[PDB]
RNA sequence: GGCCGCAAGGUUAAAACUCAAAUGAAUUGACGGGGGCCCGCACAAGCGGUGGAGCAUGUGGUUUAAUUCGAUGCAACGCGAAGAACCUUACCUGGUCUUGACAUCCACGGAAGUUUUCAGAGAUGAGAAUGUGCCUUCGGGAACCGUGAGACAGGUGCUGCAUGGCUGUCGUCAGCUCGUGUUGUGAAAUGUUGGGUUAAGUCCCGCAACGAGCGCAACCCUUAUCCUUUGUUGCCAGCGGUCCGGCCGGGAACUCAAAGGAGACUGCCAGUGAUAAACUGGAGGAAGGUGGGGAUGACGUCAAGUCAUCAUGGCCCUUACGACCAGGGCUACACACGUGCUACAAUGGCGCAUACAAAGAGAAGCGACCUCGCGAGAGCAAGCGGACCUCAUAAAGUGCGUCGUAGUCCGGAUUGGAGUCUGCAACUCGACUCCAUGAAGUCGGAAUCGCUAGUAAUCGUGGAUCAGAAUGCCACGGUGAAUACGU
């Protein structure tokens, strides 16, 4: 991956996890039927406004080794080709190749 | 297969009328692994097949076997550009097989309501020589009987 | 598929097939005593049977 | 017969296109049975390359032509099956 | 075709593991990073102290890296002056507690990996790479490997084109699971690309899983 | 040109020009519409499909501002992508940046943070409030920020025909070789051929060969039977009690869980066979001759695939091929091809009633019970890092009723209306829900594919990726056939 797309990941965890309650509670009063009519739509605009990249949905899974955005597997955090190439060393505890 | 297959199976016999033969005519008419529903189907017929009959049920069914199963098929074999069909004895178990496949077929090409009218008309017709599956041992022999003269090639 | 077929009867077709085919006797490929008279024994039946047939 | 074209490293025109057909126009007159039939054109480096596959009534003919053109290497491919063709053929009216 | 990983392929049957810790799924890729960060590490700045293997255990909130080689004085020092130095720049990275051993090889030459780099170093240094692969396998057997086989990759002595070549000596059995052979790589960066090096070494057939 | 001939022609017999070869015999391979012998869902025997329809999906074409890049006979086309609304994203349009978003080095300034207003699509620009920290030995160093200079960073730019690494393929086919000896002027040959045998260069007997190595087989996992140990969160045979619910006290038998063992070796018995190797049959046994399934891929081939995983020789870009942002595009549609799903009905549709699995997932995640709602769901909130809690009621099956062979009570595409949920946000472009709508399709030309047993067929269940987004992929059980004469 370009040193870019590696960087953007962090600059978007960062917010992620800063306006991370603003969000959660700014979102939960929209989401309460019995509320102000004022309260919550103040809110949508106020959402709307605290920074796009400061959303969870935003982030992408990208291998923490090689940055590949593609074949990612969470219990590693390593696309499969270095899951593939560390498993035969033996860096990675218990896995083996497997048959039944 | 060029070697031999080795290991045959074991049809169980008929929960009703205990017959390996009947189990087999069920496999045969069973679709989709529904063994269950054809078991229902088989009966049936036969209930339908002995109330008109008045002859017993592994007996009765058995007559419209005897009007079906062929006796000489033929097989086919290319010589220069031409494609000898060569008439050729039938095996007994052989000639089991394709009675019931016969009978199968041509109840299912036919228009009656359920699968088991059809079954029972044509087990019914069968043994008065009367349906397409005896129609069609009829033609399998007329060919056999026509070219005889290839009976004794071995190629 | 599980299981080699009869050796001997093979032999004895073997025979046969070059016989019809019209091969001599002495490509026969067997010195097995046993399979050799099966393989002549189709090939001179097989001898017969070509004269009439055309 | 239908006509598939690809082109690896090739730009399909309409000469090219209009050339390959006229020339595949030809074979059917060695077997009337062919169906479809895919091209592929390739230039690496230097090398003008042309492979062609022919579904046929009972086969699958394959062969591929180098020419210095693409022109001269579809021209070589040409006779390459025209010869599968004929032979496939007499193996079927062998009377 | 393509082979196996002989190491990989082992693994329960004859060969231990590399990293031996426990974890569940939350903090199981967080292991994984921080290893390969303490090899990335260490690899880099023992270039030059011959390093076979590095074996890393998780203990219980801490972390044993236990580092072969086969030159223990230069990894060590002055009554332990450089140790101390690499276990206080672990825990830094490890994020926790660290402490170092130094496992020692006594036959370099039946080392794979000590090989391997030994090759590398050489075709690094414009040296015959006929006289590297030859060297080696007589070093092994001479030291009595049951077998050995080197294959050397690229673009030897500068070719414009590139091919593979391969000596063997002795039994080396791939397909043979209980065989204890000792595999690995090393490429090597000349001015016409990279050299890729790979190395096989039986040392016997073994009865007992252990 | 001369001579000979009735003629056909014969005989004698040049040159210009042009090529760097043309030829003989033998050698290794490859090939033959040559031969012999053995195999293979190769044919044959059979079962169900694809090609017709609708829809999903990939590709070609066209189109486009852009429709990002790659994969292309078998061995590309549900392929890299295990999951494109934004992000991802590499592309287009417009708006910005210039030692730079991502490092190290130096000087200078300022703790780091924290809270606000305005302009702007936003990047960003301009303000405003608050804050003055930790070792510092009396200079502060250590943070981490902002500005400045330039050595530099940066490039999913090009070449897979400069490469490493990894991978497909012939092919899990039974082959591929070497040392020494011997033969030949020599390429080479012998061994590795011959007789048998085998799934097997498998084994045996012969033999100018004697030996060895990579493969074959075995060692590994799984499944089938038994035994020992251990017994909760699993188990209930014999007892006693019961709210009749392993529910309770008990029990350690049984099922099961998982460590350790036992077991199959042609070992035992006939017949054949070169007093061999093996073969065919029999016994016992849960299992019989490689018991079933997996893992495992020889020397090599195809300048096969990947410079867009990463690395990397070279080449190129450097106030732009680097960097930031909003919106769009990858989802376009006269059309062609590939892979799928659902159908065309009665071995079936619909309604009620009622049985029997396996394997797997869960942490800020799996989320019961209760309340609300026709429903998607909502609210509240037990338990569970799990043989305990939750996902999560298997379905086909079965009984009873109905429909009665109709383009139908078959099919469920299409479209209008009305909703829910995820998410800054579902116009382009999500999944699902209810009401209405009710298309093509009556079993598919030429061709063509899969499969030999718990297989095909058919029925449900789970997982990876993942905020949300499977008809794909990877797994798991239920029911459960057909037929192999043969070459
Ligand atoms: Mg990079
Ligand atoms: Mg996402
Ligand atoms: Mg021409
Ligand atoms: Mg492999
Ligand atoms: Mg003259
Ligand atoms: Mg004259
Ligand atoms: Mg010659
Ligand atoms: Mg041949
Ligand atoms: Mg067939
Ligand atoms: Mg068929
Ligand atoms: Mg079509
Ligand atoms: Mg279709
Ligand atoms: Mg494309
Ligand atoms: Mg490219
Ligand atoms: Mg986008
Ligand atoms: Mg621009
Ligand atoms: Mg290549
Ligand atoms: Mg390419
Ligand atoms: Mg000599
Ligand atoms: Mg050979
Ligand atoms: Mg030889
Ligand atoms: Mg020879
Ligand atoms: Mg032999
Ligand atoms: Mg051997
Ligand atoms: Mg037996
Ligand atoms: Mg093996
Ligand atoms: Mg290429
Ligand atoms: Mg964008
Ligand atoms: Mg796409
Ligand atoms: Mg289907
Ligand atoms: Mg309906
Ligand atoms: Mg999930
Ligand atoms: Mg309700
Ligand atoms: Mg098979
Ligand atoms: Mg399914």
Known sequence: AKQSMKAREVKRVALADKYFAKRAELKAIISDVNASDEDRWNAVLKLQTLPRDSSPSRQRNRCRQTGRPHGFLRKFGLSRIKVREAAMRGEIPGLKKASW | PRRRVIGQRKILPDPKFGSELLAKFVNILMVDGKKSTAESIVYSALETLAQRSGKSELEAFEVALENVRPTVEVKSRRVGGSTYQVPVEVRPVRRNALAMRWIVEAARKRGDKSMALRLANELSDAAENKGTAVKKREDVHRMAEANKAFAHYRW | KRQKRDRLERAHQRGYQAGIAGRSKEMCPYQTLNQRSQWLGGWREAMADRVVMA | ?95 | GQKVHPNGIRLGIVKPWNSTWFANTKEFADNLDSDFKVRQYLTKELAKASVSRIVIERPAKSIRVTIHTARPGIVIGKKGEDVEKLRKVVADIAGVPAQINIAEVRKPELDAKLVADSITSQLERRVMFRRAMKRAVQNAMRLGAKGIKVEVSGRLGGAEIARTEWYREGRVPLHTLRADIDYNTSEAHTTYGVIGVKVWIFKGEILGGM
């Not at chain 4, 399909?12 to 050339?19: D, G, N, P, V």
């Not at chain 4, 230039?43 to 390359?49: I, N, Q, S």
């Not at chain 4, 006779?79 to 032979?87: E, F, N, P, V």
């Open chain 4, 1 to 95: 017969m239908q006509l598939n074209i690809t082109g690896n490293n090739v730009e399909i025109t309409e000469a090219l296109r209009e050339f390959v057909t006229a020339k595949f126009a030809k074979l059917e007159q060695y077997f009337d049975r062919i169906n479809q039939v895919y091209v592929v054109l390739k230039v690496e480096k230097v090398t003008h390359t042309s492979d062609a596959t022919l579904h046929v009534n009972g086969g699958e003919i394959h062969a591929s032509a180098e020419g210095q053109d693409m022109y001269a290497a579809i021209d070589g491919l040409i006779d390459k099956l025209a010869r599968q063709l004929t032979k496939h053929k007499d193996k079927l009216k062998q009377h």
